[PDB]
Write a protein that binds this ligand. Structure first.
Ligand SMILES: Nc1c(C(=O)NCc2ccc(F)cc2F)c(=O)n(O)c2ncc(CCS(=O)(=O)CCN3CCOCC3)cc12
Ligand SMILES: Nc1c(C(=O)NCc2ccc(F)cc2F)c(=O)n(O)c2ncc(CCS(=O)(=O)CCN3CCOCC3)cc12
Ligand SMILES: [Mg+2]
Ligand SMILES: [Mg+2]
Ligand SMILES: [Mg+2]
Ligand SMILES: [Mg+2]
Ligand SMILES: [Mg+2]
Ligand SMILES: [Mg+2]
Ligand SMILES: [Zn+2]
Ligand SMILES: [Zn+2]
Lengths: 367, 182, 367, 182
DNA sequence: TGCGAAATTCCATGACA
DNA sequence: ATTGTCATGGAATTTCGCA
DNA sequence: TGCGAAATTCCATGACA
DNA sequence: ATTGTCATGGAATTTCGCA
């Protein structure tokens, strides 16, 4: 009010250009601007005005200003608009992000077989012999896959299947998503008893299990082809599909998962006989160099408007199963530690420490 | 002549009958002739059905060129012959009453029969749960002739469960007493 | 057999390079190639060999050849491999496509209000006052939207809601997806009785209704924000959201749907008063030029591996609701007419004429 | 002075009571003062509740600066005054027993009362279904003073349903007879 | 005739079952 | 017989205020 | 030392709940 | 406290067969 009082008598105030005629009309300070005559409200009334214009339809920066600009003008209107956008809780948790995640990491292939297992469940499927799910275990180094039909994606069915598998070899690490079968205390006990470190994907991010997920696609794709025109009796086909995929060439690797695991084909059709004259010790020597020279992809180019996490940044976690007409994002939280450009720890919306993928995060807008 | 390789020859035989453990009585022993790698499959009978059911699990991982066994009924049946022919597996039998294998396989089957007995005493009906750990021991047992374990010969890597401190493989004086009573 | 007979005695045959020693061993014609000794099977046996190698895991071109190359060699092996891939029905209907659709078309904005309505249903939603769905009617020219709560996405609820709406004006065209409420004979009769042409999107392609679909997002987004912390009682908010969105500025257009429809704001907050001194006839004159000078987007650049439909091409339609372990694509069909680079008519897998979007099509591989 | 514009003033009034049609007895008539555009809302009573319920539908499309009406109870109630104040709508009443509107609005309300009667005869209980088509006729009726229909003045475009062949708006000798009997 | 800052425009991002 | 759309907020670009 | 064609490599596309 | 993956088939590139 006092600030606007000096403007009417011709005195200069920083932010208000001098080349405009500031007058009074109907008890309101006005100004003749090129767009027309606009009301200059006092400083004490500008927060409420921006709030009323925004609350009409909870619009963003430009759509809110265009409302205010129809009646009012003051120095740095968007600065006050953005100030309210960052304080509107409903917008922060409901609006979608407009910044893509950073480029994906391509973690190094495990150096040796049985260094890391990727396990996951497929299902539910059409009932076949009373079985509904399939436990899929993929060796990260070789891609060699084991298939186990189960009646439920349970810890008991996982333990019983992995006990049979671990008869051949014990893995260093078993990687899995955070499903109920793999996060149960019983499964952790089973792994500790055998000296196996349980590695868990960030929640709701199947990309992290992409090794076994991508194998799931080939399993279902092969099962689909073998079941064309037949009833979906997939139980008896699991051994067929397991053997077929384990002996299938990867065109980019030039080897099959069987070859990367054993260094020699078994009595399967079209078995490679290149190392027939070599000895087993010479074969394993050639196999060890093959396992090291395998092609490995690199991180792709970042998209032109990506964002990378910084310690202390306000980020919001995507809501897992958002109910109808409910916000898609949790309230803002702080980045505690940046494990890699794609994985961070945040102070959860419940107060806990949560390790999440940036794919399930957005940077809180307007700082 | 071609050097011996894994999957060139699988030696199979039945061990049993044993005390019942979760409804199973026999153990189908499959040994790779080159690496000495051993697979143990519990069956309910030394039948062609039980053999096919267990070898279908193994042949879904790797198929041998040749399967060697004695003239047991489960192996000389026409059903098992058709099963082997359908998978391109040549059957090879030892002369009746003249079991023929290999030095490595003979000693491997010896270790299996002895290692089974050492853990049968005290818990004769709980060996089904122990078959996983028995295979790990057999397949990570250092071979004096080849200076490599079956695991190393099959995968070309060291195992995450090496078995340096191995058992005596001989019955202690107390285990010997609690066995004659059974 | 006779063809291979001349090759063993040193005679030249086209396709077989002369600089190799073709010999016989164990009753099979062989050749000493750099990769090793490979068996040259007779012409009469090569189709069965490619079939056996492919049928192992129904692999594509390279993964099938790598199997055959382990044992055999003959002139132009991939030519025989691709020949079988194009004849394998299971692969053609199960494999995913690797060619993206052509760039989207940006159809011209309707010149006048009520030239074309885009209608669609939102729901089901949490029960509010016994209502579960929302009929959304968007005027294509203005974006002006009408909201109608219904208990079901039915033709009767559509007719009752549009009878109230058509009290204000009758549209030339009503565009909708092929849902049950809009494809019923009763709805066609209702539109013919009022001289309204019913335009239908291609099936299972909500992009075609993108005008009203995109408005659905804003409706739910605003409903979500207004219901934060409250029970989802959205029935009484439909008039609020309708009025709020119809008076919301589009930052790229610089106008609200209300302004594009009426040329003057009503007694809503922050009403624009620029044309206050103009007459209504001068206002409508300014409105008619605004409706023509509106920004219109252009077709984006085609992706580096897109495909455009050609009359007579073998294409496959995506299966609508593919059951578990069932193929994702229908059997190949022929393009009858190319309506636009994104829409074609095909001879359906049932024998009918079907107008489909290329987004729900893939080109049949291997011609 | 500012030229008259749409949404500057809405003239509202009740027509009724009428013969029951699907449970409705009255018709709330809303006319824009500048364009002559007419909205028809059927109500069950000339009450503030029924008026708010119908004007809430209209004010969800466009809000007038001023609502004009006579001193009817539904419009002079404190509930309706609070409803108008909550939406920034100034209420404006004509003097009791001195109905004041505008020449355009007076003639528009005349056409409505006459057009309703012409279609009431023969089907006096089926006018609820006819309210949509009545609004189309009224809003596409050529205005002699402005030389534009209410539709053209409100939207700035021609209508897809022009009404060139209009009714007589006068009762034929047969409709006049079948009305005195009712 | 050019500077710094504010204002405007640009536009990749994502979600409409 | 038909076809994506557009609010969003940092960034890029233009315009403004002043000299 | 270079040509045409075959062979190999490249890699955008899409789907794994 | 953790991280995408890879079969696929036209296209781009390289290699082969021959001179
Ligand atoms: N969605 C799943 C997909 C999937 O979509 N694949 C599709 C897919 C998409 C993109 C991609 F690149 C790969 C991919 F496979 C999946 O594959 N698999 O295997 C899943 N497996 C388990 C669960 C339940 C997870 S959960 O509900 O149990 C979490 C409980 N708690 C976690 C900790 O926080 C509290 C809650 C989901 C999925
Ligand atoms: N999936 C729908 C979405 C949707 O996903 N939106 C999400 C979406 C995704 C991408 C996009 F860019 C926009 C978009 F809105 C939808 O919005 N709306 O509105 C729908 N409306 C009806 C039906 C049923 C169609 S159906 O089953 O009735 C077909 C019956 N017949 C047709 C003829 O052939 C025989 C079968 C589905 C949807
Ligand atoms: Mg999972
Ligand atoms: Mg999965
Ligand atoms: Mg025997
Ligand atoms: Mg729909
Ligand atoms: Mg929709
Ligand atoms: Mg009255
Ligand atoms: Zn908001
Ligand atoms: Zn196939």
């Amino acid at each position: 009010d006092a600030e606007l009082d000096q403007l009417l008598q011709g005195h200069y105030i920083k932010g208000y250009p001098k080349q405009y005629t500031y007058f009074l009309e109907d008890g309101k300070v006005k100004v003749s601007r090129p767009e027309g005559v606009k009301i200059i409200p006092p400083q004490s009334d500008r927060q409420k005005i921006v709030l009323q214009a925004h609350n009409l339809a909870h619009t963003g920066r430009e759509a809110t200003l265009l409302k205010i600009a129809n009646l009012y003008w003051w120095p740095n209107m968007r600065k006050d608009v953005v100030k309210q956008l960052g304080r509107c809780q409903q917008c922060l948790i409901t609006n979608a992000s407009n910044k893509a995640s950073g480029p994906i990491l391509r973690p190094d292939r495990p150096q040796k077989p049985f260094d890391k297992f990727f396990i996951d469940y497929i299902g539910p499927l059409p009932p076949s012999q009373g079985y509904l799910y399939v436990l899929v275990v993929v060796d990260g180094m070789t891609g060699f896959t084991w298939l186990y039909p189960t009646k439920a994606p349970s810890t008991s069915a996982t333990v019983k299947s992995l006990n049979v598998l671990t008869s051949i070899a014990i893995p260093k690490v078993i990687h899995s998503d955070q499903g109920a079968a793999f996060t149960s205390s019983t499964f952790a006990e089973w792994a500790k008893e055998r000296g196996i470190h349980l590695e868990f994907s960030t929640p709701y991010h199947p990309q992290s299990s992409g090794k076994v997920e991508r194998k799931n696609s080939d399993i279902k794709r092969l099962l689909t082809k073998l079941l064309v025109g037949r009833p979906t009796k997939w139980y008896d086909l699991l051994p067929v599909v397991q053997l077929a995929l384990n002996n299938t060439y990867s065109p980019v690797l030039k080897y099959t998962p069987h070859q990367l695991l054993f260094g020699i084909d078994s009595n399967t059709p079209f078995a490679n006989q290149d190392t027939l004259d070599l000895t087993r010790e010479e074969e394993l020597s050639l196999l060890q160099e093959i396992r090291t020279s395998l092609y490995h992809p690199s991180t792709p180019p970042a998209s032109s408007r990506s964002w990378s996490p910084v310690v202390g940044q306000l980020v919001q976690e995507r809501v897992a199963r958002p109910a109808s007409l409910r916000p898609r994002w949790h309230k803002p939280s702080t980045v505690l530690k940046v494990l890699n450009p794609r994985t961070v720890v945040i102070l959860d919306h419940l107060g806990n420490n949560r390790t999440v993928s940036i794919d399930n995060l957005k940077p809180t807008s307007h700082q | 002549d071609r050097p011996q390789k894994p999957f060139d020859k699988f030696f199979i035989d039945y061990i049993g009958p044993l005390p019942p453990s979760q409804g199973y009585l026999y153990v189908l022993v499959v040994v790779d002739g080159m690496t000495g790698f051993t697979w143990l499959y519990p069956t309910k009978a030394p039948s062609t059905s039980a053999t096919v059911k267990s070898l279908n699990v193994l042949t879904s991982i790797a198929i041998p060129k040749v399967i060697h066994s004695d003239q047991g009924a489960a192996f000389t049946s026409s059903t098992f012959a058709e099963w082997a022919k359908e998978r391109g597996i040549h059957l090879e039998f030892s002369t009746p009453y003249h079991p023929q294998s290999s030095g490595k396989v003979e000693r491997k089957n010896s270790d299996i029969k002895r290692l089974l007995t050492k853990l049968l005493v005290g818990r004769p009906t709980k060996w089904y749960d122990l078959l996983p750990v028995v295979q790990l021991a057999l397949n990570n047992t250092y071979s004096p002739v080849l200076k490599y374990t079956p695991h190393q010969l099959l995968f070309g890597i060291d195992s995450n469960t090496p078995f340096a401190n191995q058992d005596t493989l001989d019955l202690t004086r107390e285990e010997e007493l609690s066995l004659l009573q059974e």
